[PDB]
Design a protein around this ligand. Structure first.
Ligand SMILES: *[C@@H]1O[C@H](CO[C@@H]2O[C@@H](C)[C@@H](O)[C@@H](O)[C@@H]2O)[C@@H](O[C@@H]2O[C@H](CO)[C@@H](O[C@@H]3O[C@H](CO)[C@@H](O)[C@H](O)[C@@H]3O)[C@H](O)[C@H]2NC(C)=O)[C@H](O)[C@H]1NC(C)=O
Ligand SMILES: *[C@@H]1O[C@H](CO)[C@@H](O[C@@H]2O[C@H](CO)[C@@H](O[C@@H]3O[C@H](CO)[C@@H](O)[C@H](O)[C@@H]3O)[C@H](O)[C@H]2NC(C)=O)[C@H](O)[C@H]1NC(C)=O
Ligand SMILES: *[C@@H]1O[C@H](CO)[C@@H](O[C@@H]2O[C@H](CO)[C@@H](O[C@@H]3O[C@H](CO)[C@@H](O)[C@H](O)[C@@H]3O)[C@H](O)[C@H]2NC(C)=O)[C@H](O)[C@H]1NC(C)=O
Ligand SMILES: *[C@@H]1O[C@H](CO[C@@H]2O[C@@H](C)[C@@H](O)[C@@H](O)[C@@H]2O)[C@@H](O[C@@H]2O[C@H](CO)[C@@H](O)[C@H](O)[C@H]2NC(C)=O)[C@H](O)[C@H]1NC(C)=O
Ligand SMILES: *[C@@H]1O[C@H](CO)[C@@H](O[C@@H]2O[C@H](CO)[C@@H](O)[C@H](O)[C@H]2NC(C)=O)[C@H](O)[C@H]1NC(C)=O
Ligand SMILES: *[C@@H]1O[C@H](CO)[C@@H](O[C@@H]2O[C@H](CO)[C@@H](O)[C@H](O)[C@H]2NC(C)=O)[C@H](O)[C@H]1NC(C)=O
Ligand SMILES: *[C@@H]1O[C@H](CO)[C@@H](O)[C@H](O)[C@H]1NC(C)=O
Ligand SMILES: *[C@@H]1O[C@H](CO)[C@@H](O)[C@H](O)[C@H]1NC(C)=O
Length: 644
């Protein structure tokens, strides 16, 4: 005691970067008050049994720790400090030790195999250190152990097979490590095991079939390993499982139908594997299933209609598989299903009428399938919708009658379909909507003026449709639009000067349209614009000087128009211009020879114009092909088609 108090003081005398305010100030008067007023210290019959110095800013090492002087120690918590160095083998000499915690420290080196001498240990905690090497096999001797936590370390080698002998172990936490080799099948002997967390390691081999005897395990985390083979059907015998996470592995083969037997399983993560074959119909017998994610695999065949039996399903992640056949109505029938992602599959047929029958669905993805037919009515009136993606399908129908008002809509993508009809003004009710993309449809009619009132819109893409009419000056109301694509339509009249107001605009494409008359001269107020495709239009007259005030312009394509006159000398203030396509115009006269000052011009086409004179000094003109520079009236000082 009085010896113990001196020993601990001699240890405390080695701590560095200590403060007068340290909680260890109370380590005073060893002769009288060791067992009554010292912080961390606690005694029985006047001998220290409990040292709890957690989070006391102690900086130091365990070298001069008085192992021999504190024999009756049975509770050591030195966690959340700045301890460094190694774990001396004398820690195994605390024959009475029950709880041992050195976590959240800066300890280095291996784990002394002398820890297996601590026969009375019930909890071992060494997490969040830089301990390396392999886990001592003698730790399998501590058969009173209830919980082993070695996570967030640099441990390597395999999990000791001796750990099968830890018949009282309930929790094994080995994640964030570099453990390797196969999972020892003796882990199946852990009848008392509750949580097994081996995730985020470099484990390999197959999942031991003896895991089926782990009848008390409720959490099995083995994700982000390099496990191989197939999911053994004996995993279906782990009846107490509620969370099974095997994702980001290299597993193969089929999904065992025995997984249906897991009546308490609420989370199943199998994604990012190489699983093949059909999804068994027994996976619908997972009555507790909340979050099923088997996306990003090689699964084939149809989704079992038995998925209507998953009445607690909330998240279904089937994306990036080779699933096929029609989508069964059971797959969306859940009253609580809020995320149904099916994109990047080979689904055929039409959408089931059950899609949003309960009005709780929020995320729906169907990108890159072989679907067709109309939008089901329950989806038309699915006011809860937040994210919708229909890209790359053959959906048909009146785009005005197919889509009701979505107040909660945030992102919808109708690209690459066969939608007909006119854009309804109902989309204005989606006041939180920020991106509207409907490329490559058969949409016709005018853009309703309500669309410009949608100020929250960040991205608007109506390209490759058959939309007509003249753009109103109220287009200036799109304050926050930054990607604007109306190209590939039959919009007509002049270009509205209101595009001057879209200051956030970055990428603007109005090409392949029927815009005619002069480009608005005022258009000098787009400081974020790095792209302007006005090509393949009917625009005629001088290239306005306002375009030369668009500093950040990287690409500028005014090709296939009726522009005339000379290329202005004020292009030089577009120092950041890289690609510039002015071909197939009626431009006249020479370049001012200030194009040498401009540098980043690499791809320039000035073909089929009435210009004359010599090409200026920059790469693109030297690197131009015959087609790039052909067609002009008097090309080059020495009538050249290629270099000088
Ligand atoms: C387990 O880790 C220890 C400690 O390694 C140290 O801590 C890690 C968290 C990393 O930051 C390492 O970069 C860091 O070194 C390893 O022992 C260490 O071995 C190296 C040599 O491999 C030692 O460096 C040498 O130190 C001597 C002593 O002055 C010099 O003469 C040499 O020139 C050289 O600098 C290092 O001191 C040593 N650290 C110790 C013993 O605490 C150990 O090898 C490793 N085991 C593995 C990876 O299996
Ligand atoms: C040293 O003393 C500290 C403080 O008493 C001990 O930390 C305690 O550790 C337990 C471990 O579970 C914490 O229990 C948890 O408490 C929360 C509510 O705080 C509860 O909701 C959880 O279910 C859980 O039981 C406890 O909070 C925590 N106390 C503090 C103040 O952080 C530490 O365990 C002691 N170590 C030794 C060896 O005596
Ligand atoms: C601005 O938009 C226009 C179209 O609205 C883009 O111009 C043209 O796009 C077509 C795409 O099919 C190109 O046609 C094809 O070109 C290849 C080239 O090898 C040719 O082999 C095919 O037979 C076909 O003609 C066309 O070249 C292209 N024209 C230009 C001038 O690019 C244009 O690309 C868009 N602007 C930018 C900067 O991309
Ligand atoms: C291609 O352009 C030439 C150039 O004419 C321009 O006309 C003005 C717009 C102004 O920019 C002038 O500096 C240019 O000369 C067209 O040739 C003109 O055609 C008109 C007939 O409408 C005639 O009155 C002019 O005298 C012509 N100019 C010259 C120099 O001959 C030409 O018609 C244009 N071709 C196409 C297909 O658009
Ligand atoms: C603290 O440890 C000491 C030994 O380091 C224990 O002292 C022994 O106690 C037993 C029975 O109480 C005696 O037979 C021995 O002769 C004692 N040895 C010494 C060197 O004193 C002491 O009992 C322990 N106390 C607690 C509370 O565990
Ligand atoms: C296990 O699967 C992973 C997939 O995440 C593989 O990691 C990829 O390997 C290839 C190169 O061989 C590339 O696609 C990437 O460089 C890797 N990382 C990815 C895709 O994130 C890993 O090689 C597989 N292990 C095997 C087959 O033993
Ligand atoms: C004490 O803290 C300072 C500041 O972080 C650090 O530079 C130093 O290495 C620490 N240790 C000693 C012995 O000064
Ligand atoms: C587990 O304990 C038994 C008991 O005798 C022993 O024979 C066996 O070798 C132990 N396992 C390992 C891997 O050492």
């Amino acid at each position: 005691t009085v010896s113990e108090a001196n020993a601990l003081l001699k240890w405390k005398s080695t701590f560095t970067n200590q403060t007068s305010s340290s909680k260890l100030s109370s380590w005073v008067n060893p002769n009288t008050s060791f067992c009554r007023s010292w912080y961390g210290v606690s005694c029985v019959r006047n001998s220290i049994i409990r040292l709890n110095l957690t989070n006391t800013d102690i900086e130091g090492t365990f070298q001069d720790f008085p192992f021999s002087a504190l024999p009756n120690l049975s509770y050591v918590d030195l966690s959340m400090n700045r301890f460094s160095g190694t774990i001396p083998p004398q820690f195994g000499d605390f024959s009475k030790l029950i709880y041992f915690d050195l976590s959240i420290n800066q300890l280095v080196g291996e784990i002394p195999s002398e820890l297996g001498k601590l026969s009375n240990l019930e909890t071992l905690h060494l997490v969040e250190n830089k301990l390396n090497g392999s886990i001592p096999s003698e730790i399998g001797r501590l058969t009173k152990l209830h919980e082993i936590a070695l996570y967030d370390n640099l441990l390597t080698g395999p999990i000791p097979s001796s750990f099968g002998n830890l018949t009282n172990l309930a929790n094994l936490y080995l994640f964030i490590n570099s453990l390797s080799g196969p999972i020892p099948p003796e882990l199946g002997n852990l009848s008392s095991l509750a949580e097994l967390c081996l995730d985020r390691n470099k484990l390999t081999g197959q999942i031991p079939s003896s895991f089926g005897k782990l009848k008390n395990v409720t959490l099995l985390n083995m994700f982000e390993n390099n496990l191989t083979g197939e999911i053994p059907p004996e995993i279906g015998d782990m009846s107490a499982l509620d969370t099974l996470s095997l994702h980001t592995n290299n597993l193969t083969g089929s999904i065992p139908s025995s997984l249906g037997n897991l009546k308490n399983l609420a989370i199943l993560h199998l994604y990012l594997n190489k699983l093949t074959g059909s999804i068994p119909e027994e996976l619908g017998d997972m009555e507790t299933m909340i979050d099923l994610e088997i996306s990003e695999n090689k699964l084939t065949g149809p989704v079992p209609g038995s998925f209507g039996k998953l009445t607690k399903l909330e998240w279904l992640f089937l994306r990036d598989n080779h699933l096929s056949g029609p989508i069964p109505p059971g797959i969306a029938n859940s009253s609580v299903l809020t995320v149904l992602q099916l994109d990047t599959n080979n689904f055929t047929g039409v959408l089931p009428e059950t899609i949003c029958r309960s009005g709780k669905l929020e995320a729906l993805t169907l990108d890159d399938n072989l679907l067709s037919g109309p939008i089901p009515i329950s989806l038309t009136n699915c006011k809860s919708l937040i994210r919708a993606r229909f890209k790359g399908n053959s959906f048909s129908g009146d785009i005005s009658e197919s889509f009701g008002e979505y107040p909660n809509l945030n992102f919808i993508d109708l690209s690459n379909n066969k939608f007909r009809g006119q854009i309804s003004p109902k989309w204005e009710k989606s006041r939180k909507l920020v991106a509207f993309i409907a490329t490559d449809n058969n949409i016709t009619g005018p853009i309703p003026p309500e669309i410009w009132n949608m100020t929250q819109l960040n991205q608007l893409d109506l390209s490759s449709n058959n939309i007509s009419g003249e753009l109103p000056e109220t287009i200036s109301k799109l304050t926050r639009v930054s990607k604007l694509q109306l190209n590939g339509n039959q919009l007509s009249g002049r270009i509205p000067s209101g595009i001057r107001s879209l200051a956030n605009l970055e990428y603007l494409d109005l090409s392949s349209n029927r815009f005619s008359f002069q480009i608005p001269a005022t258009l000098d107020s787009l400081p974020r614009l790095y792209y302007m495709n006005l090509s393949r239009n009917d625009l005629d007259q001088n290239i306005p000087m306002g375009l030369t005030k668009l500093s950040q312009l990287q690409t500028l394509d005014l090709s296939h128009n009726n522009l005339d006159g000379e290329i202005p000398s004020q292009f030089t203030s577009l120092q950041n211009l890289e690609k510039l396509y002015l071909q197939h115009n009626n431009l006249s006269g020479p370049i001012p020879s200030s194009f040498s000052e401009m540098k980043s011009l690499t791809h320039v086409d000035v073909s089929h114009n009435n210009l004359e004179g010599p090409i200026p000094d920059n790469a693109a003109f030297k690197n131009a092909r015959p087609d790039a520079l052909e067609g002009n009236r008097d090309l080059c000082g020495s009538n050249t088609t290629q270099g000088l």
